[PDB]
């Protein structure tokens, strides 16, 4: 089997990307945050706290045929961002762009913090990295990936992001008329439960390309890219103005600026960020200083290639039996 699914960005800045999502029957339509750095499918429901559901649309499993509660499963989690949510857990069928998945755990909120609240736009998450990460107590759950690869043409999902524009992901099989180029395959660990990988170093513009290991984690639910303190000084020092602000938290820039591109590499491959892609806009309404797209990731613990690296990229989550990651160029 394979599935193919449209994603969109939420706002004019691509902070997030949903993708619609069936959940039981019949259908209830979710517009689901992919996630590769978490592992829970958690949505907001007939369950959730009324206060903390402002217009998002919300799963009711006592309207599915095939829901079934799970019987004493409870499911807490936290965020890099400091969100989090909560609830109990049903089993139903769960469809991704044609390709479904039955006795799919579906984690039903109970409560939501405010960031999720106010954002309208994603009605819940499903969660893309190894179900090792679930938080489902006492048993485990599997994600929907995971429960989805035997069935699978070939086990994988691959991301194409949108740069202020749809992109997809497919399920089981790789599009070779999404790319250009050759897709380059590099190492994962799993040992954190991330699809985490050495990039091979970077370059800033058209300046020379340093090579060094940076390591870090594939994660389609961070909206920015995250490097090593050095790495981002040397990038924002080609930046008239730029300045990393401790009252913002981070660097920002004068709205006024023309952006250097961020390369990366993926092995003996590169991946090119277009400036614009770094630029996320006034730090608030009507402001000339706006928030950059690369970010100090000291004191996260990791690096994380995010939507503005990934979005540059078509990016291939190998499932195989010893998994890989691989990047090529669009």
């Known amino acids: 089997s394979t599935g193919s699914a ?5 706002d004019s800045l691509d902070d997030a990307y949903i993708t619609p999502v069936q959940i039981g029957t019949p259908a209830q339509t979710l517009n689901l945050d992919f996630d590769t750095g978490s592992s829970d499918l958690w949505v907001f429901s007939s369950e959730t706290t009324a206060s903390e559901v402002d217009g998002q649309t919300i799963y009711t499993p006592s309207k599915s045929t095939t829901a079934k509660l799970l019987s004493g499963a409870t499911w807490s ?14 089993t139903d069928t769960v469809s991704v762009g044609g390709l479904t998945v039955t006795g799919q755990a579906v984690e039903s909120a109970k409560k939501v913090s405010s960031s999720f609240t106010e954002d309208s736009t ?18 485990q759950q599997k994600t ?19 740069y202020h524009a749809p992109g997809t992901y497919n399920f089981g099989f790789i599009d070779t008329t999404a790319y250009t180029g050759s897709i380059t395959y590099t190492a994962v660990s799993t040992k954190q439960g991330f699809w985490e990988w050495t990039s091979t170093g970077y370059a800033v513009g058209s300046g020379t390309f340093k090579s060094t290991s940076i390591d870090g984690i594939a994660d389609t639910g961070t909206t920015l890219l995250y490097l090593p303190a050095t790495v981002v000084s040397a990038y924002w020092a080609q930046v008239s103005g730029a ?18 591109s961020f390369t990366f590499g993926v092995g003996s491959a590169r991946i090119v960020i277009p400036g614009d892609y ?9 402001s000339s ?28 989550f190998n499932g195989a039996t010893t998994p890989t990651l691989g990047f090529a160029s669009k």
Do not use: R, W
């Open 77 to 90: 989690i936290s965020y890099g961002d400091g969100s989090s949510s909560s609830g109990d857990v049903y």
């Open 243 to 260: 300045k990393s602000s401790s009252s913002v938290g981070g660097y920002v820039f004068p709205c006024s600026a023309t952006l250097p």
């Open 144 to 162: 929907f990936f995971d429960n989805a690869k035997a069935s699978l043409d070939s086990p994988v999902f691959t991301a194409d992001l949108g």
């Open 6 to 10: 449209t994603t969109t960005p939420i």
């Open 278 to 286: 770094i630029d996320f806009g006034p730090i608030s309404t009507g």
């Open 289 to 316: 200083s706006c928030f950059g797209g690369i970010q100090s990731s000291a004191g996260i613990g990791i690096n994380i290639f995010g939507d503005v690296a990934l979005k540059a990229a078509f990016v291939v």
């Open 122 to 139: 994603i009605d819940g998450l499903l969660g893309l990295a190894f179900s090792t990460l679930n938080t489902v107590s006492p048993t």
